[PDB]
Design a protein around this ligand. Structure first.
Ligand code: COA
Ligand code: RIO
Ligand code: CA
Ligand code: CA
Length: 179
């Protein structure tokens, strides 16, 4: 059915910790910080701490069950080394994961990304959404393409080379109807 988003709260942190230590997630999420301890997740993902980095955390919901984690961020407002060429404060980036190995490759990630893109463009200040999957992460790249993102090129980030992908507000508008 329909994938929706709610703000993550401090009450979700234990659950997020469990998720971040599942093998299908560890593979693509964490980097240096792969397999975080409970304290790590509590210290790093508390919504008020993420707020200091211009990051907003969400829980993805399907049929009343939490099925994944997502975040949006102000690109111009990111940590040292991140998006240092950005000039547009309207640019938002996203990252996300599906909690359950059993639910991968069945279109749910595309639904989640579409829901996040729609949410973000419902802020009229937002001009463009970006994402930055690893070049190794072909599944994530395809999901993003299915959700309306276009590959731009390779960029150097603090987490290594990434495939920079974008979806502009104009593109989103044009694709809302076949009219
Ligand atoms: C990335 C993620 C959100 C994508 O969600 P998903 O529901 O698995 O993706 P979807 O099923 O919606 O779409 C994936 C597409 O990639 C293709 N694909 C699937 N596995 C693939 C693989 N191993 N290599 C290349 N392409 C693959 C699928 O065929 C599908 O395309 P198609 O519909 O044209 O056939 C999810 O797989 C996930 O959370 N993975 C672990 C964490 C992660 O990688 N997060 C993203 C970091 S940038
Ligand atoms: N797309 C999946 C990736 O998402 C996260 O990395 C994002 C990164 O997120 C930081 O990491 C913590 C929450 O994940 C916060 O500190 C944010 O600053 C963000 O600051 C960058 N602007 C974009 C990065 N892509 C993960 N950190 C990373 O491990 C994972 O591979
Ligand atoms: Ca406003
Ligand atoms: Ca149209």
């Amino acid at each position: 059915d329909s994938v929706t988003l709610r703000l993550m709260t401090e009450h979700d942190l234990a659950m997020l910790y469990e998720w971040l230590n599942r093998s299908h997630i560890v593979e693509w999420w964490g980097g240096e910080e792969a397999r975080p301890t409970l304290a790590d997740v509590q210290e790093q993902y508390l919504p008020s701490v993420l707020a200091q980095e211009s990051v907003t955390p969400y829980i993805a919901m399907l049929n009343g069950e939490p099925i994944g984690y997502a975040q949006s961020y102000v690109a111009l407002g990111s940590g040292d080394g991140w998006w240092e060429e950005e000039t547009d404060p309207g640019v938002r980036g996203i990252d996300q994961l599906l909690a359950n190995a059993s639910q991968l490759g069945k279109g749910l990630g595309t639904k989640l990304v579409r829901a996040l893109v729609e949410l973000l463009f419902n802020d009229p200040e937002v001009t463009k959404i970006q994402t930055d999957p690893s070049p190794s992460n072909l599944r994530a790249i395809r999901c993003y393409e299915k959700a309306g993102f276009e590959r731009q090129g390779t960029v150097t980030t603090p987490d290594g080379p990434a495939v920079y992908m974008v979806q502009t507000r104009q593109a989103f508008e044009r694709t809302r109807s076949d009219a």
